[PDB]
Amino acid sequence: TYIPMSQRRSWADVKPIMQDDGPNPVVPIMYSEEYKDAMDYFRAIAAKEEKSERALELTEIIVRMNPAHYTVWQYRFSLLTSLNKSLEDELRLMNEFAVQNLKSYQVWHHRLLLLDRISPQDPVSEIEYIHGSLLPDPKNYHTWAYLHWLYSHFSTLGRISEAQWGSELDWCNEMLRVDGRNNSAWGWRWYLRVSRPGAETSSRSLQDELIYILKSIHLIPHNVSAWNYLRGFLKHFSLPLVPILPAILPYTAFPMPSPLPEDTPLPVPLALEYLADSFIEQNRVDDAAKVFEKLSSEYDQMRAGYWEFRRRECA
Amino acid sequence: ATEFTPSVYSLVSKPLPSNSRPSATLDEQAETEDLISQLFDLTADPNALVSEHGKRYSGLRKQEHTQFLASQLPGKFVSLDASRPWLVFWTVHSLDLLGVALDQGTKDRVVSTLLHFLSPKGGFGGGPANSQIPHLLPTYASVCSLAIAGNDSSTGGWKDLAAARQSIYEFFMRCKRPDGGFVVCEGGEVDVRGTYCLLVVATLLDIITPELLHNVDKFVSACQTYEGGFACASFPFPEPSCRVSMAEAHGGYTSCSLNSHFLLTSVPLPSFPLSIDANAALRWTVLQQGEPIEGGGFRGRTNKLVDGCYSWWVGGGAPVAEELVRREKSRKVIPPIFNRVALQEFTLVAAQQDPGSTGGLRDKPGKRPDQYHTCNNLSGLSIAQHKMSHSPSTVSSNRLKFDASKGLPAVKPVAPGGGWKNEDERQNARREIWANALGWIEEEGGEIIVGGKDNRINTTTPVFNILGLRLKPFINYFYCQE
Ligand SMILES: Cc1ccccc1CN(CCN(Cc1cncn1C)c1ccc(Br)cc1)S(=O)(=O)c1cn(C)cn1
Numbered sequence: 001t002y003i004p005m006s007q008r009r010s011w012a013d014v015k016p017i018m019q020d021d022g023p024n025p026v027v028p029i030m031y032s033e034e035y036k037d038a039m040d041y042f043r044a045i046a047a048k049e050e051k052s053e054r055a056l057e058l059t060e061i062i063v064r065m066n067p068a069h070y071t072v073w074q075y076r077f078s079l080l081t082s083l084n085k086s087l088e089d090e091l092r093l094m095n096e097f098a099v100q101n102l103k104s105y106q107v108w109h110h111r112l113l114l115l116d117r118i119s120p121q122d123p124v125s126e127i128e129y130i131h132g133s134l135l136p137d138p139k140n141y142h143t144w145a146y147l148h149w150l151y152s153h154f155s156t157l158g159r160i161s162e163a164q165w166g167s168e169l170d171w172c173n174e175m176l177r178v179d180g181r182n183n184s185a186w187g188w189r190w191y192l193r194v195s196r197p198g199a200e201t202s203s204r205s206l207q208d209e210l211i212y213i214l215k216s217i218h219l220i221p222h223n224v225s226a227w228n229y230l231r232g233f234l235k236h237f238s239l240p241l242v243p244i245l246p247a248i249l250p251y252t253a254f255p256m257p258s259p260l261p262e263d264t265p266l267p268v269p270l271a272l273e274y275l276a277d278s279f280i281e282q283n284r285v286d287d288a289a290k291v292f293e294k295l296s297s298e299y300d301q302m303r304a305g306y307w308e309f310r311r312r313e314c315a
Numbered sequence: 316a317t318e319f320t321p322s323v324y325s326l327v328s329k330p331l332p333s334n335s336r337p338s339a340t341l342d343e344q345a346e347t348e349d350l351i352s353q354l355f356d357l358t359a360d361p362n363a364l365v366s367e368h369g370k371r372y373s374g375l376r377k378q379e380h381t382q383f384l385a386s387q388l389p390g391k392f393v394s395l396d397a398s399r400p401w402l403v404f405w406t407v408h409s410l411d412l413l414g415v416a417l418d419q420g421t422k423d424r425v426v427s428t429l430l431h432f433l434s435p436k437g438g439f440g441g442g443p444a445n446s447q448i449p450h451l452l453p454t455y456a457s458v459c460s461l462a463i464a465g466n467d468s469s470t471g472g473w474k475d476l477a478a479a480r481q482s483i484y485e486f487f488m489r490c491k492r493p494d495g496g497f498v499v500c501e502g503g504e505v506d507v508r509g510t511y512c513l514l515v516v517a518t519l520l521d522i523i524t525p526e527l528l529h530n531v532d533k534f535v536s537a538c539q540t541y542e543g544g545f546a547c548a549s550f551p552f553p554e555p556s557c558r559v560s561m562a563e564a565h566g567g568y569t570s571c572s573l574n575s576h577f578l579l580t581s582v583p584l585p586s587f588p589l590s591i592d593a594n595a596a597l598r599w600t601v602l603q604q605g606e607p608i609e610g611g612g613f614r615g616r617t618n619k620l621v622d623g624c625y626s627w628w629v630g631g632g633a634p635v636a637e638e639l640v641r642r643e644k645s646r647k648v649i650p651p652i653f654n655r656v657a658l659q660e661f662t663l664v665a666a667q668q669d670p671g672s673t674g675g676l677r678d679k680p681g682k683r684p685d686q687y688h689t690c691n692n693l694s695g696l697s698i699a700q701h702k703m704s705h706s707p708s709t710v711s712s713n714r715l716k717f718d719a720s721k722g723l724p725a726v727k728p729v730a731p732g733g734g735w736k737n738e739d740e741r742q743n744a745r746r747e748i749w750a751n752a753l754g755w756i757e758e759e760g761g762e763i764i765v766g767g768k769d770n771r772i773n774t775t776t777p778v779f780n781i782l783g784l785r786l787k788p789f790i791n792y793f794y795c796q797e
C-alpha cells in the first residue's frame with residue numbers, strides 16, 4: 001500500500017500546504033491520493049523555497065504523474081542548477097522518460113534548457129538522439145522545432161562544422177526518401193538549403209535545388225509539400241516561373257515528367273495554379289483568369305470562392 | 316450566398332491519389348478518408364428537405380453538448396491540472412456559443428475560482444496561485460473567462476482585474492525577451508501562442524506600452540514560413556542580424572500569429588508593425604481545407620489530417636488574413652474565401668459525438684469528444700455560419716464616440732522612457748486600440764446556416780474568440796467607456 005508522506009521520517013519536519021482554489025471550485029479534478037499528497041508537500045517545499053535532494057526527488061515524482069506540470073518542471077530546473085547536479089545524468093533521465101512514454105511542451109523544453117546550460121563543444125550526440133526519436137514519430141512538431149533550435153543555437157556559437165551540416169542534409173534526404181509527403185522534413189530541408197545564415201547560394205546551388213524539387217514533383221505529382229516548396233523557392237529567390245513551365249505543363253492537361261506514373265489523375269490543381277501565376281508573370285491576365293475559373297468551377301471546387309477571388313483579381 | 320461554397324454532398328468524393336508511391340502519410344490519409352466518408356454516407360444531407368429515411372440526422376445536438384459540458388472531472392484529467400483556466404474557458408465559451416446561460420451563483424463560482432489562480436505579483440497560473448506560477452496562456456484563458464462569466468459589481472471579478480493591471484503588466488515585462496519574443500512563464504518556452512495570449516490581454520486591459528511591444532512585430536513576422544502559414548517561433552541570429560522560422564506552418568501558430576499581427580496594426584508606433592505576407596497567409600489558410608472525401612474540415616499543416624479544432628485555428632484566421640489582404644490591396648490602389656458550407660457539414664456530420672451518447676464534439680470520427688474540441692469546433696462553426704468583417708466605418712464610429720478623458724491609471728513602465736512620449740500620444744493609442752478591438756461586425760445578409768436555423772449558434776469575435784456581447788462591455792469597463 002501507499003505510505004503517506006506525513007508518515008515518512010524524511011519528511012517529518014514539513015507541514016503540507018493544501019491546495020487553495022477556495023470553496024466550491026469549478027472544474028475540480030479528482031486526484032489520486034499519491035498526486036494530492038505529493039502536491040501538498042510540493043506546495044510546502046516551494047513556499048519555503050527549499051533547494052534539496054528531497055525536493056528534487058519530489059519534483060520527479062510529480063512530473064511522472066503529470067508531465068505537463070510546468071510549475072514543477074520550472075522548480076526542477078532551479079533545483080538542478082542550485083544543487084549543481086549533473087546535467088548529463090538529467091539528460092539520461094529524460095531519455096529514460098522517453099522509454100516510459102512521458103512527453104510534452106515541458107519535457108522537450110527541459111531538454112533545451114539542459115543543452116543550453118551544458119553548452120557542449122559538440123552537440124552531435126543530441127542531434128543523433130533527436131534523429132532516433134523522430135524515426136517512430138516522424139512529424140512530431142516540437143521535436144522538429146527543437147532540432148531547428150539546436151542547430152541555430154549551436155551554429156551561432158560556431159559549433160556546427162561543415163561535415164555536420166553535410167550529414168544533416170544526408171539525413172534529411174533519407175527522411176524524404178522514406179516518406180516524400182513528410183512536410184516536416186521539407187521544412188527542415190528549407191532551413192538546411194535556404195534559410196539558415198550559413199547556407200550557400202550560387203547559380204549551381206539554385207540549379208541543384210531546382211533539380212531536387214522537380215524530381216520530387218515528378219515522383220509524386222499530387223504531393224502538396226513539393227509544390228509549396230517549389231513555389232516558396234521561386235518566390236524567395238525572385239526566379240521567373242516561365243522558364244520552368246515545360247516541366248509543369250504536362251500536369252495541367254531540367255527534369256521532365258515520366259508516361260506519367262499510375263494513379264495520377266489530371267489536371268493537378270497546383271499545376272494549374274502554377275500555370276495561372278505564370279500567365280500573370282507574362283501580363284496575360286485573361287488567360288490567368290480562365291485558369292482560375294476552371295480551378296473554381298471544375299478542378300478544385302472546395303476552394304471555388306478563393307479561385308473566384310483570384311479570377312476577379314485579374315478581370 | 317452559396318454559389319461558391321458547394322456542399323460536400325454535391326461534389327465527387329475521390330481519395331488523395333497515390334501516384335503509385337505508397338508512404339506512411341498516404342496510409343493514414345486513406346484510412347482517415349474512409350472513416351469520414353463512411354460517416355457522411357450514413358448521414359442525411361443537412362441541406363436536403365426530404366430528410367432521408369434510415370439515415371442519421373445531422374442537426375446540432377445542443378442539449379447533448381450542454382450536458383457534456385455540465386459534467387467534477389475524473390482522474391484522467393490530471394494531465395490538464397495545469398490548464399484549469401482552459402477547462403473553464405472551453406466550457407463557458409461553448410455555453411455562450413450554444414446560447415445557454417449560467418445562473419448568477421454558478422457565474423460567481425467561476426469568478427471566485429479564477430481569482431484564486433491570480434498571483435499578487437502578476438498573472439494567472441493553470442491553477443491556484445499557492446500551487447502554480449503565472450503563465451501567459453492561462454492568463455488569456457482566465458481573462459476571457461472573466462469576460463464571459465464576470466461583471467462590474469464587487470463580486471464580479473472585473474474590479475480585481477482592474478486592480479491587477481500593473482502587476483499583470485510587470486509579469487508581461489518579465490516575460491519579454493529583447494528579440495520581441497516572450498517566455499510563456501518563468502523559465503518557459505518562447506512562442507507565438509504566448510505573444511497572442513499576452514497581446515489579447517494587454518489590449519483588453521489597457522496596458523499596452525511601447526517598451527512592451529518593441530520587436531514583437533519582428534518576432535511574429537519572422538515566424539512566417541515559405542508555405543505562407545506561421546511557425547511557433549523565429550530564431551534571432553546575433554537587435555539580430557537575421558531571424559529564421561523554426562518549424563512548419565501550423566494552424567495553431569498561424570492563428571496566433573495572424574491575430575497577434577492584427578492586434579499590432581492598431582498600435583500607432585512609427586513603421587510598425589513590420590509587414591507579413593498576407594496573400595501567402597490567405598493562400599496557406601484556404602489550402603488547408605480538406606477535400607469532399609474528408610468532409611471539408613481543416614487540417615493543421617500540409618500532408619497531415621483534418622481535425623475539427625482547426626475549424627477555429629485555421630477557419631477563424633480566414634477573416635483576419637482576408638482583412639490584411641484587403642488592406643494591402645487598398646494601399647496599392649464578393650465570394651466567401653473558404654467553403655463555409657462544407658466546414659459546417661464537417662462540424663454537424665463528422666465532429667459531433669454520435670447521437671444519444673455523451674455529447675461533445677471531437678477531432679474526427681474515432682476520437683473521444685473533449686472540452687477543447689467542443690469549444691474549437693463550435694468557435695469555427697460560428698465563423699462559418701456568420702460572415703465576419705473588420706469594418707473601417709465601424710472603427711470610425713468608435714473613434715467618434717471614444718472619451719479620452721475617461722480611463723484607469725496609466726501603467727508605470729519598467730524603464731523610465733518605456734511609456735508613451737506624452738498624454739496626447741497615449742490617448743491616441745488608447746483610442747486606436749479600443750476602437751479597432753471593437754471593429755468586427757457580422758455582415759447583414761452574410762449568414763449561412765447549413766441545415767436550418769435550429770443549427771445557428773452565436774457569433775464569436777475573430778482574434779479574441781469571445782462573443783461580441785461579452786467583448787464590448789468588458790473592454791468598455793477597462794477603458795471606462797461603458
Ligand atoms: C491550449 C492547450 C491547453 C491545455 C493543454 C494543451 C493545449 C494545447 N495542446 C492541445 C493538445 N490536445 C491534443 C489535440 C488537439 N487536437 C489534436 N490533438 C492531438 C488536447 C486535446 C484535448 C484536450 Br481536453 C486538450 C488538449 S497542443 O499545444 O496542441 C499540444 C501540446 N503537445 C505536447 C501536443 N499537443
Ligand SMILES: CC(C)=CCC/C(C)=C/CC/C(C)=C/CONC(=O)CP(=O)(O)O
Nearest residue numbers: 141452508565567568571615616619622628
Ligand atoms: C494557446 C494557443 C492559442 C495554442 C495554439 C493552439 C494549437 C492548435 C497549437 C498547436 C500546437 C502544436 C503544433 C502541437 C503539435 O502536436 N499536435 C499535433 O501534432 C496535431 P497535428 O497532427 O494536427 O499537427
Ligand SMILES: O=S(=O)(O)C[C@H](O)CNC1CCCCC1
Nearest residue numbers: 374375376377378379380670671
Ligand atoms: O441535443 S438534442 O439532440 O437536440 C436533445 C436530445 O436529443 C433529447 N431528446 C429528447 C428525447 C426524449 C423525448 C424528447 C426529446
Ligand SMILES: O=S(=O)(O)C[C@H](O)CNC1CCCCC1
Nearest residue numbers: 046434435436444445446447448
Ligand atoms: O506573492 S506572489 O509571488 O504573487 C504569489 C505566491 O508567491 C505564490 N507562490 C507559489 C508558491 C508555490 C509554487 C507556485 C508559486
Ligand SMILES: O=S(=O)(O)C[C@H](O)CNC1CCCCC1
Nearest residue numbers: 372374764766767768769770771
Ligand atoms: O427555421 S428554418 O430553418 O426554416 C427550419 C427549422 O430551423 C428546422 N429545424 C428542425 C425542426 C424539427 C426538428 C429538427 C430541427
Ligand SMILES: [Zn+2]
Nearest residue numbers: 622623624678
Ligand atoms: Zn484537434
